[PDB]
Amino acid sequence: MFKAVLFDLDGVITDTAEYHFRAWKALAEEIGINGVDRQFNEQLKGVSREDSLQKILDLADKKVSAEEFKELAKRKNDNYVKMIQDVSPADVYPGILQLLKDLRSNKIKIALASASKNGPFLLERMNLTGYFDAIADPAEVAASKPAPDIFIAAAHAVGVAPSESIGLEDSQAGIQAIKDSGALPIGVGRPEDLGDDIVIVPDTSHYTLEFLKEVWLQ
Numbered sequence: 001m002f003k004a005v006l007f008d009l010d011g012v013i014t015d016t017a018e019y020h021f022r023a024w025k026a027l028a029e030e031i032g033i034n035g036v037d038r039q040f041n042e043q044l045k046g047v048s049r050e051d052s053l054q055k056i057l058d059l060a061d062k063k064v065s066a067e068e069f070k071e072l073a074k075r076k077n078d079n080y081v082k083m084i085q086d087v088s089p090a091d092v093y094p095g096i097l098q099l100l101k102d103l104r105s106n107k108i109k110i111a112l113a114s115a116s117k118n119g120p121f122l123l124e125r126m127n128l129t130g131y132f133d134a135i136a137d138p139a140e141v142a143a144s145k146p147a148p149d150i151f152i153a154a155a156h157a158v159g160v161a162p163s164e165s166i167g168l169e170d171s172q173a174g175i176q177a178i179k180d181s182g183a184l185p186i187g188v189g190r191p192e193d194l195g196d197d198i199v200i201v202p203d204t205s206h207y208t209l210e211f212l213k214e215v216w217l218q
């Protein structure tokens, strides 16, 4: 049987995308720029802060100095930090707390394999810390998803090989990161987005201990 589960955060445990989007929208409006709607935010999704700010600046062809750039970057981030202060256990996606309790009582290790620089904070805010055996620091990995590095660290941090582990993800690069780590991915989304060579559920309600055991058992 599998020994660990490795959790993505955004789109699996909860939604941070929403707050990033408002952060960026609130910034673009504040400095004159139109067109930073949810549609355009699909271009900012897994992208770096600097890379995102370029793309918002390219919309109006706005010129900025290097210090003006880094202050705009900071100002978005400050906003985002303010905005995730209202995160509560009310924001934990469906079926997820229950999956954690069951994994825990079955002595299955639990690890976070998230790109969020705010993982630990977010987990305390949702009252989930007590379930998690390790949090993989995204600052301590050489390269981000789709590289496997983070899933490797999450597994190792609870003392398993990723081959002993299931990864849960909502995005294409995450699936590929789980795949290249040696872990088994179970997706949440559409096969349109994630692939048809892997097991995907339509939402997080379907991620049960029994379903993960079913999938492992091949």
Ligand SMILES: [Mg+2]
Residues within 6 Å of the ligand: 008, 009, 010, 011, 012, 169, 170, 171, 174
């Ligand atoms: Mg995600």
